[PDB]
């Protein structure tokens, strides 16, 4: 197929995020858009990404086409992108993936196609007691702040439509409040819930800061946390994180 | 259990820093009328008092009076987390000791710490009961400057006051110092019931005056050969009190 | 004695930093037509040339041609003193070696240093004499970016050029790279006498391209299986030259 | 006597400078103004200071009066001066010196009178081959810059009405040029000369930066260097420094 992205800089950070969880990804180009799906070795995090055709400046996909690529080699190329570079994604005759960056000069990188694993789909239409929406930049900064507290676990607690994120410390703990009242939340729904998730997994998604404008937070007691990082044109990058013991 | 909320973490932390020769351990006393610490130096010359009247305590839940001995350092660690001046401190009693909480409505953040404390009998405020013939109010920056002055000369500081002038004098090996405090220069207020005079340790006086700089409304009172009282208030209500015994 | 003045300390220092594998010692050659250093790596693949044509030398007093071996570090120490871009370097011969002087008319300051040097016979510029079928000019920042590109993939770099396009290609374990340089994107100029192609060490090419970033007008020339020439000029006239032998 | 200075802040730096050379000074209050004269233990530096009565806001001197004071105790008091403090100098009945600072509050320091040495006057009407004038702030900054070169000697060299100050370094040397052409000098007179003086002695006068507006440089080959730091109302602080071996 042939696909083109104008804001390659932002587009790259999606894969720089993925690289925190997986090593090999399977670009599933469908008529509806690019589907990317993966799971970290610990089976703690499940990722579901939809990048609609409308997101791309040029989307030419005749028949569904899957392309497996080593994420490290892919991101290494994507890291060489400027703020003015455009990006092309294409597959030649040998079914290889061709990444073409074009800005100051035109350059093309080619990667050999590899075997792509099949990712079984956990219950996506799952129901969450608590649902919220917030600015990605806001949520991210709050997470990067929780990380510096010095903990391995982060507690998500919803009470009266308000979300409290807390992480333990040598002395005690620190809790950051998010809600419609303090501007942390854009909207809040559902009842109350409390769970503890791995901090590293939550933090590792912060790289979605640039590509995503708003994020939707959903979870429950002893049920997976879902962070949906909204992308332009109806796109989204979903991260499911299993609760703690 | 005992609950207490103070409208300022910054001020609470400023008062603690004022405690001279803390010993790294204090006995917080919780009473119906106020929370306070009462320290007296070994030489018995200086008494340091940290006090927060109930009038400035929000959601103050007091069952029975209690005194808790804690490590003042642990108490400072948590207060340091306060980033804004609009921060708030909440003290909660526990079986093991204290639970100090610092929350700021601005960024809607909180911070906990469980300080290991040894509770005990409550101490009482046994302050010198005497008529302060002379009282005046001045910015702490002035007292700190005078402290610097006294650092250059003097073994004893003689402070006196006539109708409307307060004088501080010292002597040492021929050298001499003598400053004059009048109203509006710099005294914000001066009240003299009668001409009074007294002498205090320049060493203690210096240490105290340097600390009063944390307030713009420091009140100093004294009389004929009676202990000197120094009040260091804060905007939030918290207050340091110093009693200095005279040289007779 | 030999005298020489260069209109820029900054540029002079930039050219020296470009010398790859300096050995901490160079042989400055003073001739009627130019001052230059001629270095050739042990593998004989890369030749590094620092050159300053007389056209860009003020008050150039040359009696007899001379070559002086000095410590390039000592030479850099004095050049580092230059604070402004309007600084000036003056090289004076002495019995013991060189006398480097850095003066700036702005702040009217000077700086001396007597570098211990061992004078000897003059070296000659024995550059490859061949017809460069393809030449183009580009900003060094582009070449440095392409260097970064080549860092990700490739063992050998095949560079070729048709009527009006220059291509660089590499392969490694299935992975592939291929960039296209056209005029005005980014090439400031491109001159093709005839379709040419050659292959050079990606390792050497990388190291060189990274250095060319010190110039906005880097000139690259090559031809069918002949050494590649890379010119790195400065505003003040100073110039680095690199010759890279092809893989045959 | 009774004397008053409005700009006490600047007035203090004169004595902070002196403290670099001497330990005990003799305030010689005359009808014409305050005369202060001293010499460092090495007899390398001779100082001659005249502060005219006009410099002071209030100058009440009936008969000539000399007052010896330990400079360290005097400057320690003067260091406690703000930018708004006024200064009084007075002698009581016991012939003690009374320094009274008045700003936010009024404070008075008293020092016991001591025995004051008599300083023999070297040839003041000496003739210098080279003479120049420059901004004090300019000259000072240039000296503070020479100090950082790392030398114990500073070379004064006048050639064609231009002054060159140079100090040796581990590698070579560094020379700063001053002249009417580069703005370093306000005016230049006389022929040529070259001498080397102790760097510490020259630098130690830099503290005259605030009190002095312009400085006059005069010297010759193998003859003392004279730095005259001009003070308001015709005042001056002269420093004579002997040439090197």
UniProtKB/Swiss-Prot annotation, chains A, D:
Protein name as catalogued: DNA polymerase sliding clamp 3
UniProt entry keywords in alphabetical sequence: DNA replication, DNA-binding
InterPro entries for the chain: DNA_clamp_sf, Pr_cel_nuc_antig, Pr_cel_nuc_antig_C, Pr_cel_nuc_antig_CS, Pr_cel_nuc_antig_N
NCBIfam families, A to Z: PRK01115.1-3 (NF002220)
GO molecular function list: DNA binding; DNA polymerase processivity factor activity
Matching PROSITE patterns: PCNA_1
Upper classification of the organism: Archaea, Thermoproteota, Thermoprotei, Sulfolobales, Sulfolobaceae
Gene that specifies this protein: pcn3
Function noted in UniProt: Sliding clamp subunit that acts as a moving platform for DNA processing. Responsible for tethering the catalytic subunit of DNA polymerase and other proteins to DNA during high-speed replication. Both trimeric complexes inhibit DNA ligase and both 3'-5' and 5'-3' activity of Hel308 (Hjm) helicase, but stimulate Hjc, the Holliday junction cleavage enzyme.
Superkingdom: Archaea
GO biological process, alphabetically ordered: leading strand elongation; regulation of DNA replication
Similarity section: Belongs to the PCNA family.
Species whose genome carries this gene: Sulfurisphaera tokodaii (strain DSM 16993 / JCM 10545 / NBRC 100140 / 7)
Subunit structure: The subunits circularize to form a toroid; DNA passes through its center. Replication factor C (RFC) is required to load the toroid on the DNA. Forms dimeric complexes with PCNA1 and PCNA2, and trimeric complexes with PCNA123 and PCNA323; does not form homotrimers. Crystal structures show a heterotetramer of 2 PCNA2 and 2 PCNA3, which would be large enough to clamp a Holliday junction.
One Pfam family from the record: PCNA_N
UniProtKB/Swiss-Prot annotation, chains B, C:
SUPFAM superfamilies the UniProt entry points to: DNA clamp
GO biological process assignments: leading strand elongation; regulation of DNA replication
Keyword DNA-binding: yes
InterPro entries assigned: DNA_clamp_sf, Pr_cel_nuc_antig, Pr_cel_nuc_antig_C, Pr_cel_nuc_antig_N
Pfam families reported for this sequence: PCNA_C, PCNA_N
GO molecular function annotation: DNA binding; DNA polymerase processivity factor activity
Keywords per UniProt: DNA replication, DNA-binding
Family indicated by similarity: Belongs to the PCNA family.
Role noted for this protein: Sliding clamp subunit that acts as a moving platform for DNA processing. Responsible for tethering the catalytic subunit of DNA polymerase and other proteins to DNA during high-speed replication. Both trimeric complexes inhibit DNA ligase and both 3'-5' and 5'-3' activity of Hel308 (Hjm) helicase, but stimulate Hjc, the Holliday junction cleavage enzyme.
Protein name per UniProt: DNA polymerase sliding clamp 2
Organism the protein comes from: Sulfurisphaera tokodaii (strain DSM 16993 / JCM 10545 / NBRC 100140 / 7)
